Amino acid sequence: ATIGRISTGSKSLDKLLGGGIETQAITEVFGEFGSGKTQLAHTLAVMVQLPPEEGGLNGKAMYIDTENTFRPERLREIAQNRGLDPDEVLDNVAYARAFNSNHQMQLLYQASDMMVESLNTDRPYKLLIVDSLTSHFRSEYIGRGALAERQQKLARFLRMLHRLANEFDIAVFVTNQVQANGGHILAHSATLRVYLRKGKGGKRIARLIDAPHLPEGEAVFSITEKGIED
Ligand SMILES: [Cl-]
């Protein structure tokens, strides 16, 4: 299947990403608390629903939340300010709370179920958000004696996400709270990594790092009544 791209709402960020976030891939935004990761996720959940000419993939979204970050009223606001029917937009975002790391992995079976049900419809799933990828793994596997198991369980979760991305031709977008002001996670991955931070004058700065097929660079964007914009 053709690799599809979902607009972020920011022309500059889309340019940095080679046109938008990709289907058949896991995009991982990382950065400090307050860097805009959840705002980007919410905006993508709306943008995916739009036609291609408007930055979407005529799709629906599923949003897995681990730290009570999902805000339906924020989706409604983004939808309304983009000229859409907020009730319709909300109906196209399937919410699931993950209570712990084992449940978080269980929810991928539910995701898979929903994706096959919608597959040959005029509105298939095109986006799975996991906000956040790592929080329950970090809270449940603490200290040296649990580190190996944390890594194995997270690796298994990421493998399952890649399977969903590739089997159902969806974009997977995950968030990760990290403090690395150099903008690099040491651990190697098969995610497309974007480092987010606060910039000057209310803006956010995204830095694309370690992509095989896109050059490293930065883009500036704002958080607004429309979600993310330049
Ligand atoms: Cl990976």
Residue numbers in the entry: 108 to 297, 310 to 349
Task: Give the article text.
We therefore explored the possibility of using a more stable orthologue as a surrogate and focused our efforts on archeal RadA from Pyrococcus furiosus, a protein that was already structurally characterised and is closely related to human RAD51.
The humanisation series could have ended with HumRadA22, which displays a fully humanised BRC4 binding surface. Nevertheless, we extended the humanisation process further into the oligomerisation groove and “behind” the Ala pocket, in anticipation of the inhibitor design process expanding beyond the core of the FxxA binding site.
